[PDB]
């Protein structure tokens, strides 16, 4: 043992890279002109959007996903659009999970469920978004809104 090279390193646990996908509506006054379908008029060609959790860390095994945003005055489970003059009326965006069920908007941390992830290999969460009518009829206008995706780690 004439000389010795000693190596000392430390691997830090990393979180996850979250890439969001901006959803763009098209519809073009199809349902809006016809329905007119009570307050449960949640019939709109769902636009599939995904939240990319990639790449992630090896510790990230389970997380608590949940949405927060500005609710509608009529239906609390609907994300209200921008209250502008050029905007529409009597509409509220509904958010659905991969199993096509209504996700509780503005829900606390004690209501959300643990979405188990894959440690290492990239994860992907697929969600849907459609329009639900609160008032009737629906006037033609812009469809802009804002929301917030909270990723609560274990």
């Amino acid at each position: 043992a004439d000389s010795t090279i000693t190596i000392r390193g430390y691997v830090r646990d990393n979180g996850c890279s979250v890439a969001a996908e901006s959803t763009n509506f098209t519809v073009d006054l199809m349902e809006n002109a016809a329905k007119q379908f009570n307050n449960i008029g949640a019939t709109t060609p769902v636009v599939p959007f995904r939240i990319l959790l990639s790449p992630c860390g090896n510790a990230v095994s389970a997380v608590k996903v949940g949405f927060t945003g500005v609710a509608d005055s009529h239906n609390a489970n609907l994300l209200a659009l921008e209250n502008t003059v050029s905007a529409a009326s009597g509409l509220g965006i509904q958010l659905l999970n991969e199993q096509q069920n209504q996700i509780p908007l503005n829900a606390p941390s004690s209501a959300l469920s643990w979405t188990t992830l894959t440690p290492g290999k990239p994860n992907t969460l697929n969600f849907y978004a459609r329009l639900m009518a609160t008032q009737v009829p629906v006037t033609a206008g812009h469809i802009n809104a804002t929301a917030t995706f909270t990723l609560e780690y274990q």
Binding site: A1, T4, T6, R8, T26
Partner: protein
């Protein structure tokens, strides 16, 4: 779905990926919808298609309708009016820059114009028992200079015994990016690839293997495959997945794959959309001379021969080695040497058999002319075999055998003045061998050696080395055995010794605050099987906070051999500071008692001024952060910024990304940064500025109110006094770094309005962050 044909202002997509939006004309052709788009060459090249991949596209006009569906095999297009988009499916074999880790040429930083100086003054004093004393002092001096893209260097040293300047090296290197090579002017050296290493002083244009991405350097099986439809290709090796990427329909080519010969064979699978699989395995074995398919390494040199001996001449010469990679694991090579009294030609040819192991065999003919004007012709052929890590753990790294004729002489042999170095006892046959064997989990057996024969004498050069390493948990059991027998001497010099390394790291808590976790004991006993036997116990480690100072204490005993015994003792200190290094060692061997001493360091002379630090190493990153003081650099041991706020990074890799990060915990309480982490991409021998804007002064959080209401979100705020600035968040709060004790504040959010002013109390100096409240003007 479908709409009547015509011009379409539609966003163009390439394999479900947006690119650009132009007016696309659709004509009636052979497809699904019965219509085909009319695109041009200039658009497809700016879309993702590599026009060089399609032979016959350069003949078409500038705005001619390219028949992609016919001219290009396995290519389909589709227009969709339902979502206003245009889906295309081009094979990835027609795309460029597929290499993972690829770095664009324009990102490469040529560096900054600055002077260079690297000192390393060492030497030792020996106190003999019977004889007297002996002082020695050797000072290094690596001068240098960078001018944009030119790198000047000048090596020289000074010596003292018990006395003048001796010159070493002086060159001027430059990297030629368009040629992907390097131009060396002055003192240099060639590669020992084909012909033996030659020291010279002239011009050399050789390809740099450092420019290529690390996922493309070295030989590796370039996997070619053709998929019918959209498939997902995955590649496994030794049970674990190594490669994974989805590919469009049509032919494809994978020229990545990190070189790992001793990892086993590749397992490729192409799972189609339906479920059909194309299972085929490609074996892996690599010889150091092999070139990857497409890679071309060359080395044209020209100058005078410079050895440094007084018994040698300075003849003119030329050397142009060339290597190229061919499909199916084939590799051709062989350069040519032309000189005044010597010439030589080489022919390579080498293939990766894979299942039988890679092999390359080249032959070099030489027409030499010895100093006595006696011509001698001859050839020299070498063999190079390699096999991957077998199932039993058999790793045949290299089996080499070179055979030269009786009339074969190297170029260096024809550079001497007198005959009787010798030209009547040239080397005949050399046999190299290096094989490692993994013995289970915690054991590895190492084997190596050489065997040289000479024309005339029946004498043989013999070297041999075998070492078995066992790893018991934390303890590393090392046992080696060497054997060196020269021809021009008598007796076999073989040494037999074992080493036991026991680190204290895994003996305590992993979170222990004791400095004993940074230490390790090393006991070794030696015996040359000829009377002499030694034994040495020693403990070494590091100290201080950043672990710069390296200590070592070892004492032992030696005796036998020829009747010479005595106890030993050694102590070494090696410190690396932010202003330079220092190394002092002391040796005690009863009869012999010496004392080592040496201080090295690096000096940079940039535009801003001068910065001290550790000894430079070819590529050095200059940190520029005026304001910081004791700023620790992450991933860098011993690197601290000076009092000015500047620093130098001795450790920097070329043609890759280097993360220059400053540890913000070590920053002053009156200093903050806009960005503490930056990346640099230096060329070989470059000096890149790593700038970090610092803010000297008090950090404060202001609450700006306008008309009994706080300022809106996203309101820009700039200081009149200092250059520093910030952005207003919620509740009209704004964080500012490096602010004066009192000064005017400018605010502008729409089209400036608000004008603030404040005067913090001088007593609030010993606070890292004070909060206040102010108003505006209009």
């Amino acid at each position: 779905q479908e709409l009547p044909p015509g011009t379409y202002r539609v966003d163009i997509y390439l394999n479900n990926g947006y690119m650009a939006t132009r007016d696309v004309t659709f004509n009636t052709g052979d497809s699904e919808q019965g219509i085909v788009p009319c695109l041009t060459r200039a658009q497809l090249a700016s879309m993702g298609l590599n026009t060089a991949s399609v032979a016959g596209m350069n003949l078409l006009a500038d705005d001619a309708c390219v028949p992609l569906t016919t001219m290009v095999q396995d290519a389909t297009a589709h227009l969709d009016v339902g979502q206003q988009r245009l889906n295309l499916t081009i094979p990835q074999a027609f795309m460029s820059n597929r290499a993972r880790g690829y770095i664009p040429p324009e990102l490469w930083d040529p560096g900054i114009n600055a002077g260079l100086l690297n000192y390393n003054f060492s030497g030792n004093s020996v106190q003999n028992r019977i004889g007297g004393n002996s002082h020695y002092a050797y000072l290094n001096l690596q001068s240098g200079l960078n001018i944009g893209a030119w790198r000047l260097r000048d090596n020289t040293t000074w010596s003292y015994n018990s006395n003048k300047w001796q010159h070493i090296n002086t060159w001027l290197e430059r990297d030629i990016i368009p040629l992907r090579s390097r131009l060396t002017l002055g003192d240099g050296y060639t590669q020992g690839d084909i012909f033996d290493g030659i020291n010279f002083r002239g011009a050399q244009l050789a390809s740099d293997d450092n420019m290529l991405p690390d996922s493309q350097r070295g030989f590796a099986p370039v996997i070619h495959g053709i998929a019918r439809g959209t498939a997902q290709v995955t590649i496994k090796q030794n049970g674990y997945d190594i490669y994974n990427s989805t590919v469009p329909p049509g032919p494809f080519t994978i020229n990545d794959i990190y070189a790992a010969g001793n990892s086993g064979d590749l397992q490729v699978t192409i799972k189609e959309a339906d479920g059909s699989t194309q299972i085929f395995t490609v074996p892996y074995s690599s010889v150091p001379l092999l070139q990857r398919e497409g890679h071309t390494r060359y080395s044209i040199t020209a100058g005078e021969y410079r050895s440094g001996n007084a018994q040698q001449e300075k003849p003119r010469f030329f050397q142009s080695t060339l290597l190229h990679g061919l499909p199916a694991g084939w590799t051709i090579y062989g350069g040519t040497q032309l000189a005044d009294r010597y010439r030589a030609f080489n022919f390579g040819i080498g293939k990766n058999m894979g299942a039988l192991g890679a092999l390359s065999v080249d032959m070099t003919q030489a027409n030499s002319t010895l100093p006595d004007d006696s011509q001698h012709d001859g050839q020299s052929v070498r063999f190079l075999y390699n096999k991957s890590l077998n199932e039993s753990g058999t790793n045949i790294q290299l089996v080499g055998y070179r055979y030269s004729t009786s009339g074969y002489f190297n170029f260096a042999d024809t550079t001497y003045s007198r005959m009787n170095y010798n030209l009547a006892y040239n080397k005949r046959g050399k046999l190299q061998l290096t094989v490692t064997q993994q013995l289970g989990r915690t054991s590895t057996l190492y084997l190596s050696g050489s065997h040289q024969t000479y024309w005339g004498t029946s004498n043989v050069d013999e070297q041999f080395q075998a070492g078995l390493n066992t790893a018991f948990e934390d303890i590393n059991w090392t046992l080696s055995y060497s054997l060196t027998k020269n021809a021009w001497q008598k007796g076999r010099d073989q040494m037999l010794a074992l080493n036991v390394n026991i680190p204290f790291s895994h003996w305590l808590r992993s979170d222990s605050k004791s400095q004993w976790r940074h230490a390790s004991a090393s006991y070794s006993m030696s015996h040359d099987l000829n009377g002499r036997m030694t034994n040495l116990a020693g403990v070494y480690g590091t100290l201080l906070e950043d672990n710069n100072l390296s200590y070592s204490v070892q004492t032992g005993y030696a005796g036998g051999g020829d009747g010479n015994s005595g106890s030993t003792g050694y102590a070494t200190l090696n410190y690396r500071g932010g202003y330079g290094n220092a190394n002092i060692g002391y040796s005690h061997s009863d009869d012999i008692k010496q004392l080592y001493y040496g201080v090295s360091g690096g000096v940079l002379a940039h535009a801003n001024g001068v910065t001290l630090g550790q000894p430079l190493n070819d590529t050095v990153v200059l940190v520029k952060a005026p304001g910081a003081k004791d700023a620790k650099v992450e991933n860098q041991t011993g690197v601290r910024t000076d009092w000015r706020g500047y620093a130098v990074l001795p450790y920097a890799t070329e043609y890759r990304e280097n993360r220059v990060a400053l540890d913000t915990n070590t920053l002053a309480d009156n200093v903050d940064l806009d960005n503490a982490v930056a990346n640099v991409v230096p060329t070989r021998g470059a000096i890149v500025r790593a700038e970090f804007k610092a803010r000297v002064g008090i950090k404060l959080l202001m609450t700006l109110t306008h008309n009994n209401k706080p300022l809106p979100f996203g309101a820009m705020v700039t200081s009149e006094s200092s250059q520093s600035s910030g952005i207003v968040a919620d509740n009209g709060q704004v964080y500012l770094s490096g602010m004066p004790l009192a000064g005017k504040v400018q605010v502008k959010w729409g089209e400036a309005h608000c004008v603030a002013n404040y005067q913090l109390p001088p007593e609030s100096q010993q606070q890292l962050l004070t909060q206040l409240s102010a108003e505006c003007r209009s």
